[PDB]
Paper text:
Cyanobacteria and red algae use extramembranous antenna megacomplexes called phycobilisomes (PBSs), composed of phycobiliproteins (PBPs), to harvest light. A typical PBS contains an allophycocyanin (AP) core—two, three, or five cylinders of (αβ)3 trimers of AP—and a set of radiating rods—stacks of hexamers formed by αβ protomers of phycocyanin (PC) and, in red algae and some cyanobacteria, phycoerythrin (PE). Here, we reconstructed a cryo–electron microscopy structure of the >10-megadalton Gloeobacter violaceus PBS, with diverging, conformationally mobile bundles of rods composed of stacked phycoerythrin and phycocyanin hexamers, stemming from a pentacylindrical allophycocyanin core belted by auxiliary phycocyanin hexamers. The bundle-shaped morphology is maintained by linker proteins, including the multidomain linkers Glr1262 and Glr2806, which are unique to Gloeobacter.
The AP core contains two antiparallel bottom cylinders (A/A′), a top cylinder (B), and two lateral AP (αβ)6 hexamers (C/C′), which are attached sideways to the top B cylinder. The pentacylindrical GviPBS core is assembled by two copies of the core-membrane linker ApcE (or LCM), which has four conserved REP domains (pfam00427) that bind within the cavities of four AP hexamers. However, we could unequivocally localize multiple copies of only the core linker ApcC. As in other known cyanobacterial PBS structures, ApcE is the only linker in GviPBS with a chromophore. ApcF was modeled in its expected position in the third AP trimer of the basal cylinders, although the corresponding density did not allow us to distinguish it unambiguously from ApcB because the two proteins exhibit high sequence identity (70.8%). Because no justification based on density alone was found for an alternative location of ApcD (instead of the common location in the fourth trimer), ApcD was not included in our models.
Numbering used by the authors:
A (entry chain A): 771 to 867
B (entry chain AL): 1 to 160
C (entry chain Ac): 2 to 65
D (entry chain AK), G (entry chain AD), H (entry chain AI): 2 to 160
E (entry chain AF), F (entry chain AE), I (entry chain AC): 2 to 161
J (entry chain AB), K (entry chain AV): 1 to 161
The structure:
């Protein structure tokens, strides 16, 4: 999961920022989907994708990380890029999942 | 979560009442305590690792728990227990700044008893550890801060 | 923030699965309040039945 | 509140409060006593602020209090004034909190949807809040007014 | 699912081939169909107003909207009108389908439990649904109204 | 049926039914009466269709009804005919629905796996369905036959 | 887990170093091991047939398969035979392991609850498991059968 | 810096800066001039602070400057002092910024990994920073010292 | 043990055990008796191995047994030796299992965290294990030593 | 990726040829080398942290890079550089077990030059570090293993160059 | 190209406005700076060869670049690099006289990045060389001139990077 959501390189640096999240998963009180949501709603995600990229490139990365694909068509680019404006990154991530 | 200031606001909002002097006095009380709390929080953050170490030494280690067949036996279990200790400390610090116990309920306290019972973690020993942390914290923070710090530690203990 | 604890069962109507997939069929999960609405709909659309909903964290009818 | 916001950011990061965050808390606690007085002033002048702002709004927008308009009629005009009163109460709460979060939960989320069902025009509501700000500013001292202005501006921005 | 499919499913569990009696029920549905389509279009066009009128009849000018009421605060108000919209949309779907099942699968499932945890008042919600029904009845006209009413009543009974 | 499909698309979009979608529903309800007649015809001729198709299948495949073959023996031959009857019943359901979905859920999902455990040859089953189609086509009028053919073809495609 | 690991774990909770008595238990397992491997290979090769025979004994020619029965429709039939395969594969794993724990960890845990929600009949499933056991017993031969039977019985008791 | 942090939070929310956020910015700009002086003081006393702290650290931890220890030898001792100097420079940067972010990027991310490769003990490094704090506090006025303390504490917390 | 490993791979693939995998299991069960003897040898020599290794470690690292150091004092020195004994017991368990998994669960997961709370230096612990390996190797025959070495090396790698 | 066994198979498959004695000989060669490689891999895994430490000491540290204004200055950059070193080591170990250089091309070598150029990481220094790791690794693995290990390290170095 | 005087004129021309006092003051500002700039330019022209030599000594030479396998290895490459350095110097001098950065954009800056990437010339090293030239130039020109000279050098550096 760390490698999917962050990239490989950033995932290496992770020591235990998410240790509390891991425990809830280990406990089987959260699902894997929920765990992926919360990795997305994280300062680390935001710092590594959102903050140094224009909003279009942000939608790319989100598609890559949460669905494994690029953006299929201009209508899809509109819908998601739209929602990223006028709401958080936390909204985008939440919509995909 | 909720804090002291927001708690007052919310009580007034359900009544629909504008803020009144009595309410203001409660807010004013918090504001005086605030400066002390900030100092205490900084102390705790800096000494957090040691606080946990000392508390473990007081209760957890050199005990049946650490000995084979004990709950905290094996490295994995030992590490888990000290991780939990850290959680309690961090949340108590948050609560102390906030001036409200609610955050403890919302994050730490909810479902913990049930989790521990399924795991077979001993609640009384955990409570003992929390009380030990409180004592260590009390020293570092100093007396005025200690009273404030103690209530949140006691709240955690009672919940568990 | 308010959290919802939800237990729901979803049957795999489209295809028989060789993998055990016990977790997918029957799941208890913690949902953020905002997410739950959408999640509830998605379970319904799947044809899964939500046996139980509880508010894990927060207070009901709290203004803040 | 300021403190709630800081704690929440820390919890997300799973870290103890940063020095900078702590400093902001310190500043807030010092400011609080002054803030309480500002809030108290507006509460006392609340009745007049609402009345004056209402009149200004109706002068600015004849349409709202016209047979077509939503505000028209005694019942409706009362409700419009009640709304202005609500927003003022929220602003006072905000000043003491030092953050718009208390205001935001009660008043700014779903506001568009609520008013659209009612068919009340959102811009007119904003004008009313602007009007209230001007009245409030006059009673407040300049520095106090600036603090109050920020909260008033947020409301106007939100709608 | 649908009236047509409901008949089919009942026969399938019996293992019976479709019979004339079954066919007659299907035939009955086919005649009603045209009316239903007209009703659905009316409802879709007037949906916003229907909700507005129903809210005016029951929800607003009430304790609920007043401070300390369930629908107090913008967030709660918006939630309640969103729920009203869903009931209307699903009832329209049910009317076209000729089957109550979709209401059970979509609306009715998990609603009661959600509402109880939230502390939303069921009776008030039911009142709102009944109000929508009355408004809808007018717009759709009498023949359509009877059909529309049953689905609204079904929703109300489920919530209660 | 078609109506269910339309509703489902609308629900996914969370929107009221589009005019175009509504029009398709109208067309389907008009078509239904004709569809019912086609289904009725096959139901009446069901016993003979199965019998004739069975004979054709056994002529086409001597092996299935041979000591080695699965179909061989009275019990087994009855079961093979029962299966043919089942598929015919499903086809009738399909015609009234106007969609293959009813057919598909009952008969086409996991069919390969079921027959492989039974050890029944899938191609022989397909031939039987083809045989049934030919018999059914003869009794049906040409336009009716074309409609029925589509459903029959789907079954043959599914069991391949 | 495994017989070998079970011995180890029992010693670890005691904190005792491995002793001859412990070694003897491990030695006992090692002798049985060769037989178990042969049995497992037999089961794997005949798995499809085992399921077929067991189904014939209990599941098919029954109300379940008839319309209105749980195993009616191709989808449900396929699901039931998939479940049967699971039980067989896990029992084979358990037999090699010499420990019932794997059955508890994977197969047995949550199955009852899943089945109750699904409306699958537990008693019929148990019947199928018992049928598989009988078929398996024949193929494996007597010495292997005793070992095989215990795991099948364990599954049945759990369900 | 304070301002960077505020902007970043706003951008994530996709909103204009909140009144509360704006207020914090105002407070920071007023504080800045005082902050600059505090930083200047520490810079001037830098050489002595490092020297005194080093001595204290070595007294507190004989082991680090022992044949086994990492710090032992002239080359190694110099490097240990250089590290202390680095951390002091970072703290000054932090005070002017009003936030730990500048400190954090240069010094606190990957610090564990770097020191683990070096085999330097992290707790000893923390003690050195604590020692530097005490020296720095003495030279600073009380209020100035408190401000400086927060940044020093953060560093100690980070390692 | 090894067999668990094989089963786990099969379960992931959702397949019955491969012939090759089965063969490896057969080889392991044959090897086990030899492995038991190797383990027995180390158990008998355990007391001396620990003692010798301890002395070597203390010579290698004077600091650990110094007033600053964690090991310093009789109580602490005993605990350090107890830890060495624990690791030796784990190694013996590993040899009989034929896998590091038994070792890993008890000793290598969370080890870093546990020692960091204790403040014990991890590299020194590793040296102690290395020292134990050298002593153990001498008592063991060459081929036996190689087998034992692998488990010892793993521990050293883990604590690193 | 591919391994030696699969590489032979794939070459034959494109030709459509059945496996022949010459091909068999290559496979046989691999099988003998295999046991040595497994031992080498275990050695490297256990000593990985130290290998990196030693190599850094030889080339990277006590240098302008670590000094302010150098690429490896700041903790974040230092940590990144040692992470990259670990990658090279892990992949080389994988390649050594496989007996094929292809994995290095598919994962490590592809896009590395471009990444480094954008980052401004100095290639020559990185190459130096890889060569240093090779030397340290050579010692630990022992001579027979060293020759095999060296080729993969050299392959990485040549790619980066 | 454009200069300061023409830039003011062009801005007014698009507006269609006659020259105004505010505009005149900007022109007046330039005229005072002009005399200094002319002196600086003459200094640079006379010392150009040395400036390049010193800057190369500071950054380019005695480095990996000059060593075999480096970009500036071989006489041909070395000569190319110093030719590029001369270009930058000449254009910066032109820009300083002009009082406008535009000429740098029109001649030097446009397409340079792409050219360098195809060539494999290292941009950061080139930037380093430009910065070195700036430092040398600063000394010769003297302080008042140096500030003016520095901005154009920085402009080149920013463009390349
Ligand atoms: C230490 C004082 C005692 C102790 C602790 C211990 N805890 C676990 C396991 C869990 N603890 C928690 C608790 C939390 N998870 C969270 O997210 C939070 C809030 C921030 C808390 C407090 C949970 C959920 C688990 C399960 C998974 C996990 O590893 O966290 C164990 C492990 C028990 C086991 O069988 O594995 C232990 C040992 N037990 C003691 O011995 C002390 C008395
Ligand atoms: C067959 C002997 C009887 C039978 C079986 C049956 N099962 C299902 C559906 C499911 N069964 C399971 C069980 C498991 N999942 C696992 O991971 C494991 C352990 C490895 C087991 C045993 C699950 C989860 C399902 C859900 C569907 C899925 O594909 O996962 C059905 C279908 C019922 C339905 O309507 O969905 C059936 C019929 N029932 C009988 O009648 C036989 C007696
Ligand atoms: C005045 C500036 C404008 C105006 C006001 C207006 N409001 C209503 C009706 C309602 N207004 C509210 C508002 C709130 N309820 C809340 O909980 C909050 C947050 C604290 C607010 C601000 C509500 C809920 C109602 C519904 C009625 C009720 O309260 O029971 C009306 C009447 C419209 C109607 O049909 O009811 C009017 C006229 N109208 C304008 O055009 C002015 C610009
Ligand atoms: C309005 C007539 C009454 C009312 C409604 C009300 N509902 C909520 C919150 C929720 N209601 C739902 C319900 C649904 N979710 C679904 O998926 C469906 C089927 C389409 C329904 C009907 C849910 C899930 C929520 C929680 C989150 C959300 O917004 O969806 C509230 C807010 C309560 C709170 O404490 O926040 C309210 C007010 N309550 C009334 O006052 C009316 C009588
Ligand atoms: C005839 C074309 C071929 C044939 C048939 C055959 N079938 C069986 C046994 C079964 N067939 C079914 C099939 C279904 N059950 C369902 O619910 C459905 C979907 C509606 C189907 C199609 C089943 C489940 C059985 C088991 C018995 C039962 O259901 O009671 C046999 C007997 C073999 C056996 O071992 O039972 C035979 C012979 N065999 C051929 O070779 C023909 C080509
Ligand atoms: C000796 C090589 C080094 C050393 C040892 C040392 N250990 C402790 C304290 C403890 N050690 C453990 C470790 C374990 N618990 C387990 O379950 C396992 C795996 C089976 C191990 C290895 C524990 C639990 C403790 C805590 C105390 C207790 O016994 O309950 C100390 C004492 C320090 C302290 O603060 O307790 C020491 C000195 N330290 C060195 O310096 C040597 C290099
Ligand atoms: C002193 C408190 C403790 C100590 C210090 C110590 N450090 C080194 C070597 C290095 N330290 C660094 C650290 C940094 N580089 C940075 O960019 C930053 C952030 C601005 C830091 C903190 C580096 C890179 C090195 C490597 C050498 C180099 O700079 O090229 C040593 C030498 C040991 C070694 O193996 O090199 C020492 C001794 N260690 C202690 O024991 C003291 C308690
Ligand atoms: C170490 C010898 C040199 C060094 C390294 C260094 N690397 C980075 C940053 C990155 N390095 C990589 C490389 C890889 N990612 C991969 O997937 C692979 C193949 C498996 C490799 C080799 C990547 C992609 C990054 C960027 C993202 C990240 O940092 O994780 C840095 C940081 C540079 C920066 O500007 O941030 C450094 C310092 N530094 C030297 O100078 C040494 C010569
Ligand atoms: C010796 C006969 C004369 C002499 C030599 C001299 N050379 C330098 C410095 C350099 N000379 C070169 C030459 C080459 N680099 C290449 O790529 C090639 C072809 C492969 C050649 C021939 C270079 C590049 C340098 C610069 C040094 C560097 O590597 O950075 C010096 C030193 C002067 C200085 O300031 O560097 C000297 C003394 N000097 C004489 O007068 C002799 C007649
Ligand atoms: C010196 C600081 C660096 C360096 C330079 C270098 N450049 C080339 C080759 C070319 N340089 C240019 C550049 C320009 N042409 C223009 O029009 C402009 C804008 C005014 C510039 C700056 C061109 C076009 C060439 C190619 C044709 C030619 O040589 O005339 C080389 C040679 C590259 C080769 O592989 O042959 C070099 C070495 N390289 C360094 O090492 C320094 C960082």
């Amino acid at each position: 999961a760390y490698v999917q959501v962050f990239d490989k390189d950033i995932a290496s640096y992770i020591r235990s920022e998410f240790s509390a999240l891991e425990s809830r998963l280990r406990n089987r009180e959260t699902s894997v989907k929920e765990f992926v949501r919360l990795l997305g709603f994280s300062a680390l995600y935001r710092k590594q994708f959102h903050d140094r990229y224009p909003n279009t490139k942000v939608v790319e990365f989100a598609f890559k990380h949460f669905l494994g694909r690029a953006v299929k068509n201009q209508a899809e680019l509109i819908k998601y890029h739209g929602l990223l404006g006028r709401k958080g990154i936390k909204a985008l991530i939440g919509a995909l999942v | 979560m909720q804090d002291a200031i927001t708690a007052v606001i919310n009580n007034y909002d359900v009544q629909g009442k504008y803020l009144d002097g009595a309410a203001l006095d409660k807010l004013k009380a918090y504001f005086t305590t605030g400066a002390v709390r900030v100092r205490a929080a900084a102390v705790i953050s800096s000494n957090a690792t040691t606080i946990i170490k000392e508390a473990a030494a007081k209760a957890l280690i050199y005990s049946d728990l650490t000995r084979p067949g004990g709950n905290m036996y094996t490295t994995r279990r030992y590490a888990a227990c000290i991780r939990d200790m850290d959680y309690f400390l961090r949340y108590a610090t948050y609560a102390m700044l906030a001036g409200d116990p609610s955050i403890l309920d919302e994050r730490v306290l909810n479902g913990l008893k049930e989790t521990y019972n399924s795991l077979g973690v001993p609640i009384a020993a955990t409570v003992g550890g929390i009380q030990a942390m409180k004592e260590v914290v009390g020293g570092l923070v100093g007396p005025d801060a200690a009273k404030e710090a103690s209530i949140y530690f006691d709240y955690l203990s009672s919940g568990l | 923030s308010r959290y919802f604890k939800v237990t729901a069962c979803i049957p795999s109507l489209k295809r028989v699965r060789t993998g055990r997939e016990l977790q997918n069929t029957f799941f208890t999960k913690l949902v953020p309040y905002e997410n739950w609405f959408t999640e509830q709909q998605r379970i319904q659309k799947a044809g899964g039945k939500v046996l139980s909903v509880k508010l894990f964290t927060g207070v009901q009818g709290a203004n803040t | 509140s300021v403190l709630t916001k800081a704690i929440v950011n820390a919890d997300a990061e799973a870290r103890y409060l940063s020095p900078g965050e702590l400093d902001r808390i310190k500043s807030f606690v010092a400011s609080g006593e002054r803030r309480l007085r500002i809030a108290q002033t507006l509460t006392e002048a609340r009745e007049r602020i609402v009345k004056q702002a209402g009149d200004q709004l109706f002068q600015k927008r004849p349409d709202v209090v016209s047979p077509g308009g939503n505000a028209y009629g005694e019942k409706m005009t009362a409700l419009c004034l009640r709304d202005l009163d609500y927003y003022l109460r929220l602003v006072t709460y905000g000043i003491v909190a030092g953050d718009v979060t208390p205001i935001e939960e009660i008043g700014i989320i779903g506001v568009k949807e609520m008013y659209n069902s009612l068919q009340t025009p959102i811009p007119a509501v904003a004008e009313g809040v602007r009007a209230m700000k001007n009245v409030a500013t006059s009673l407040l001292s300049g520095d106090d007014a600036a603090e109050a202005g920020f909260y008033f501006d947020y409301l106007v921005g939100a709608m």
